[PDB]
């Protein structure tokens, strides 16, 4: 019952969720427009567009109650967060000699499952899946830190630096998510610490996404342009 | 309460829906068969097979109530309408030199998001997401209309003509759905106009699909066949 | 009412469901490591990792009631069993000249659709969709038995033998599922027959998946390995 907890009484988080949704939409447009002017491949503009627009659309379930609303987080991250890791995977490939799409799939597949464990954690009211999720996230991080790093180092010195920058960014932001999820004291969530109240929890999982999507998109695409100079 | 409305009173749409399903299943079997007879790549038979068989299976939720029924259309279009666009895209690729698979993804991705907006709108009884869906639709027809057209025009004249025909056929039909959705007077479906009664909506929503899937299946495969015969 | 029936009273399947999840997680870790030890392509490890881990996860919904619980088998096979087939397909492709990724798509799509029929059947309380599934599954067996077999025979004798063994293994086992599903006396799923009680059904759908996931991942990677050893 995440939704009722988030929107009962004040629903203080709604200004933030509204602002997220709008900055998402306008960012999505800008992302489509950018790579025309920017000298980065279109696939990046496109991917970030979907990251941000999919996220936006899902968060509308907090403004308007549907059957989705209690799980709108996992509906969003389901497809947003693998697209993020795809953006990050393809950047690494960009200049490089050997592309490795089996690793892309692993990268993306882990994220998806990771996010489904959250889904499962909450629905079950049980933390067991959450632990499996965290192990997977470590697996993602490993994947980013090593194999994809190496592939990125095959290419130009600028791009490899760009990857490292993006990867550590995305790495560390990702690790925050299971944190605020665990320490949330929303009754539904089986996190056994209770530090953040529903509105706080909700607001964290608006600001955090903002950095991981809206900023990420620009960060990714400016960094690839600025490398290829 | 889309299902509830649709099966209200007589349930007038009942037998149309049944004929759509039966018909889908038979189309499917042909689609698997045709390519071998037709000198068209098997991949095309396979895509149309799933399109027409997926749709048919989802529509059985109007004949037997389930937790899916209210959102059946979306459960269908979710995977059917990107497959439709995959065929169209792959047709454009068929005889061309440069293949843009990131554009294929954008094409297919937009459709999926664009059907999910439809689902969101009904689920929150809210019209907002629909507008984004409409914006995405226009991105789809733009994609089809230009980049994919460009790629199509590297190929022989017949294959370019084929794409151009199918691209208009599916583009025009595709714009009808958000129309009759908005137009519909089922209450679950938001938007102000209530022009179409639930049975009229339902019947619009098996007629258009019959043209987008069954007819489209054959049309695609015959245009690709006629173009390759014309150029050999 | 699937969860309630299974877990009601003694919940006699809970140990098997536990033993299954624990072995799945452990098998998964091993699958990731095995490829580097066997000179088998890492991708096979990846795919088998996800098969057991995803399956394991979905089965936690029998240990803890959720909205997914009643439909957990479908949520599992919905992605697990296309992956099982991806592995089969890629095995066949492994030594071969022609990679036909449309057959891979057809293989995977039939499976996924074929699981969704099971979910529709339960959700509808109707046996109709089950029947489409069975057809579809005979589509799958067909694919495996022929075109995929031909592509395997393109390769070395060791690789070709590997595929045919696995294809047999997995074919036979895949047929058992629509059988147990049908004869199961869980009220929710609409077989005419009521031979198994929920616990027996549950046990069967623990032990059979053990052989199709945990065992199969090892079997697949060792057969390839062996095969690659046999030809310098
Ligand atoms: C834009 C949103 C982003 C970048 C979300 C990232 C979310 C995660 C990495 C969540 C991870 C989780 C676990 C590792 C365990 C289960 C709970 C989750 C879903 C928060
Ligand atoms: C076989 C069925 C087909 C080809 C259906 C096409 C359906 C659409 C293009 C629906 C479009 C919609 C929007 C663009 C926004 C409103 C919601 C939808 C799904 C009606
Ligand atoms: C690891 C689990 C596996 C390999 C499960 C296989 C499951 C099936 C082949 C199920 C088949 C079905 C039909 C053919 C029709 C009715 C619905 C199903 C899912 C029982
Ligand atoms: C792509 C972003 C554009 C979205 C357009 C938003 C219009 C929604 C109208 C708000 C109704 C209150
Ligand atoms: C507008 C120009 C598009 C030309 C495409 C011709 C095919 C149109 C088929 C539509 C039948 C309803
Ligand atoms: C490979 C290892 C597989 C181990 C499976 C062991 C599970 C056996 C548990 C059976 C207990 C059934 C008791 C039910 C009645 C109390
Ligand atoms: C391979 C070793 C894994 C064996 C795990 C056995 C687990 C048995 C669980 C016993 C059930 C206790 C009551 C639910
Ligand atoms: C070339 C391989 C194509 C993969 C087919 C994908 C099968 C599963 C599709 C699931 C649809 C998501 C909704
Ligand atoms: C549901 C999880 C899927 C989220 C998006 C998946 C898109 C992947 C895709 O477009 O493939 C691109 C890349 O793997 C091809 O190299
Ligand atoms: C849905 C949860 C994960 C399911 C899929 C994740 C793993 C799929 C990756 C398959 C793979 O690596 O094979 C592709 C390889 O042949 C590309 O060359
Ligand atoms: C199921 C959602 C996760 C998507 C993963 C996927 O599409 O793997 C892509 C990989 O096979 C590209 O080579
Ligand atoms: C944690 C979820 C799955 C992790 C994927 C494990 C794959 C790691 C293997 C890397 C790879 O094969 O790249 C080659 C490099 O390790 C040595 O050449
Ligand atoms: C090759 C063309 C085959 C067309 C077959 C469509 C026939 C479907 C008609 C069903 C019908 O009218 O019965 C519906 C109603 O009686 C069910 O209760
Ligand atoms: C692609 C498959 C072509 C058509 C397959 C569906 C035919 C099976 C029909 C089953 C049926 O109608 O039985 C339903 C009855 O037992 C319950 O009302
Ligand atoms: C798929 C091939 C045609 C089978 C469709 C039959 C659906 C069905 O039997 O639903 C009728 C329901 O009213 C039975 O009570
Ligand atoms: C991403 C794919 C989203 C699909 C969500 C599930 C499809 C519809 C469904 O779950 O039926 C809604 C039912 O729960 C309404 O009560
Ligand atoms: C399941 C609902 C969407 C179906 C997606 C399955 C196909 C998606 C992408 C396939 C494609 O791009 O085929 C060509 C690919 O092998 C690139 O070489
Ligand atoms: C359909 C559900 C996700 C849509 C994305 C499909 C996709 O990524 O396939 C197109 C492209 O990746 C083929 O290479
Ligand atoms: C549900 C929202 C997701 C829509 C599809 C997400 C990805 C669409 C585009 C993928 C892409 O650009 O991959 C192309 C790349 O693999 C070319 O090498
Ligand atoms: C939904 C819409 C998402 C994509 C809309 C814009 C992306 C199209 C890019 C483009 O066409 O650049 C390729 C160039 O060759 C076109 O002529
Ligand atoms: C409501 C939206 C429907 C309008 C779409 C019709 C597009 C048909 C015209 C395409 C065109 O002008 O492309 C010509 C190209 O050579 C210009 O770069
Ligand atoms: C290794 C993964 C742990 C094995 C499964 C543990 C399990 O699912 O326990 C969770 C449930 O019993 C909580 O009541
Ligand atoms: C490779 C083995 C890794 C860990 C296996 C542990 C499974 C055995 C644990 C059985 C247990 O918890 O029995 C508790 C019982 O008394 C509760 O009824
Ligand atoms: C993704 C294509 C269709 C699969 C639908 C996935 C939904 C599975 C879960 C359904 C559910 O939670 O409804 C069951 C219960 O809440 C209603 O009795
Ligand atoms: C439905 C489950 C499919 C998840 C992703 C599988 C996939 O991406 O395999 C396609 C690719 O490995 C074929 O080259
Ligand atoms: C779980 C949803 C996964 C979406 C299925 C599409 C996967 C895809 O586009 O990967 C196949 C493509 O890379 C061909 O190898
Ligand atoms: C229920 C969802 C079923 C989706 C399965 C449709 C996948 C069949 C598409 C074949 C494909 O994209 O092959 C591409 C490759 O052959 C291009 O050369
Ligand atoms: C395909 C399987 C067809 C079964 C069937 O015809 O049963 C329909 C009904 O008469 C069963 O009593
Ligand atoms: C649902 C499964 C139906 C898939 C049928 C695909 C076509 C059947 C095999 C085929 O295409 O073999 C091609 C090969 O023999 C060309 O020589
Ligand atoms: C009931 C049968 C459904 C599955 C069809 C089995 C087809 C096997 C086959 O055609 O093997 C012939 C192969 O040896 C041709 O070289
Ligand atoms: C590969 C070994 C298969 C293991 C099957 C799992 C056992 C499930 C119990 C079945 C059962 O006892 O059916 C017999 C009885 O219900 C029929 O009268
Ligand atoms: C949790 C552990 C599950 C136990 C299953 C592992 C046994 C699978 C059998 C592997 C095998 O015999 O491969 C060797 C054979 O193919 C010749 O190399
Ligand atoms: C605990 C079970 C350990 C079994 C290990 C057997 C093994 O490593 O032999 C397989 C490999 O040496 C084949 O070359
Ligand atoms: C394993 C799940 C894969 C994708 C299915 C997503 C499930 C749909 C999201 C939540 C939902 O269906 O809500 C159903 C019920 O909890 C409403 O209260």
TrEMBL record, chain A:
Q: What is this protein called?
A: Bacteriorhodopsin
Q: Which organism is it from?
A: Nanosalina sp. (strain J07AB43)
């Amino acid at each position: 019952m995440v939704y009722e907890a988030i929107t009962a009484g004040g629903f203080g988080s709604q200004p933030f969720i509204l602002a997220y949704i709008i900055t998402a939409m306008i960012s999505g447009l800008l992302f489509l427009y950018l790579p025309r002017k920017l000298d980065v491949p279109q696939k990046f503009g496109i991917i970030h567009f979907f990251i941000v627009v999919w996220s936006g659309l899902m968060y509308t379930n907090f403004l308007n109650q549907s059957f989705l609303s209690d799980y709108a987080w996992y509906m969003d991250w389901m497809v947003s967060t693998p697209l993020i890791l795809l953006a990050l995977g393809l950047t690494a490939f960009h200049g490089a000699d050997t592309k490795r799409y089996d690793l892309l799939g692993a990268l993306l597949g882990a994220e998806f499952t990771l996010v489904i464990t959250g889904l499962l954690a909450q629905a079950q009211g049980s933390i067991t899946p959450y632990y499996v999720g965290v192990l997977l996230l470590l697996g993602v991080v490993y994947l980013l830190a090593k194999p994809f790093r190496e592939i990125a180092e095959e290419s130009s010195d600028g791009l490899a630096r760009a990857y490292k920058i993006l990867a550590g960014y995305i790495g560390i932001f990702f690790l925050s998510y299971p944190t605020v999820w665990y320490i949330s004291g929303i009754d539904a969530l089986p996190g056994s610490l209770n530090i953040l109240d529903p509105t706080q929890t909700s607001i964290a999982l608006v600001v955090l996404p903002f950095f991981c999507k809206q900023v990420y998109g620009f960060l990714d695409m400016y960094l690839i342009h600025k490398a290829e100079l």
